[PDB]
Amino acid sequence: ATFEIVNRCSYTVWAAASKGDAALDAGGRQLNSGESWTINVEPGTNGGKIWARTDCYFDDSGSGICKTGDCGGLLRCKRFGRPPTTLAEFSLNQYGKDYIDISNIKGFNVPMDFSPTTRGCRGVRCAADIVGQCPAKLKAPGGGCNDACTVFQTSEYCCTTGKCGPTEYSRFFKRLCPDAFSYVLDKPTTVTCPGSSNYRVTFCPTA
């Protein structure tokens, strides 16, 4: 599958793509405002994620740090990033179908649209000003709005027992972005697409 990753933000982001134990394609790249990066993701990829990283500093060797979404200090991510990270999530060619979603379960840093570029399904978007409206106890100094599990590490926020309900914090994310997952047992906002669809992820789709 082809993913086009587009930075429509007025600021530079460092895109990342990983399935947790390996990079997808190159794994990461700098995207200045307006730049597009096309990657190829192997069919059958399960549990892939794409996210943006902000305020990064990398040396010649691709080693450094980012204030949001850092993946062990690497430009080319092999593992998932540090919250807060708005997440585009996908599993491809699962018994004939692709499944896509946006998640705020690991917080929010950059607004995002995740849409097919081929026919057969709709896209999803979370583009509200979650950072500006973020509850004080979830605000991340480096930027972004943490999820409650990251901040408080309780069974209820992290849904550790497989039982949990919505919370004051999850409802905040859900109010501003109804089409994104707000906690682990949220009613699924997953979209089913034809197997082997292609996609575009746009950072800052409205601004």
**Phi, psi (rounded to 5 degrees) for 37:** -125, 120
Joined tokens for residue 75:
């430009």
Experimental method: X-ray
Q: How many domains does the chain have?
A: 1
Q: In angstroms, what is the resolution? A: 1.5
Three-state secondary structure of the chain: CEEEEEECCCCCEEEEEECCCCEEEEEEEEECCCCEEEEECCCCCCCEEEEEEEEEEECCCCEEEEEECCCCCECCCCCCCCCCCCEEEEEEEECCEEEEEEECCCCECCCEEEEECCCCCCCEEECCCHHHHCCHHHECCCCCECCHHHHHCCHHHHCCCCCCCCCHHHHHHHHHCCCEECCCCCCCCCEEEECCCCEEEEECCCC
- The alpha carbon of residue 3 and the mean position of all alpha carbons in its chain are separated, in whole angstroms, by 14
Breaks (C-N over 2.5 A) in the chain follow: none
User: Which pair of structure tokens corresponds to residue 202?
Assistant: 């746009």
CATH number, domain of 191, equals 2.60.110.10
**Cβ contact 48:32 at 8 Å:** no
Structure tokens at 33: 């405002």
Cα–Cα distance measured from residue 59 to residue 106, given in angstroms and rounded to the nearest whole number: 27
Q: Please list, in sequence order, all residues whose beta carbon lies within 8 angstroms of the beta carbon of residue 141, skipping any fewer than 6 positions away.
A: none
CA–CA separation, 127 vs 177, rounded Å? 7
Identify whether the C-beta of residue 52 lies closer than 8 Å to the C-beta of residue 16. yes
| Owning domain of residue 151 | 1-207
Kindly give the pairing relationship between strand 97-103 and strand 180-181: parallel
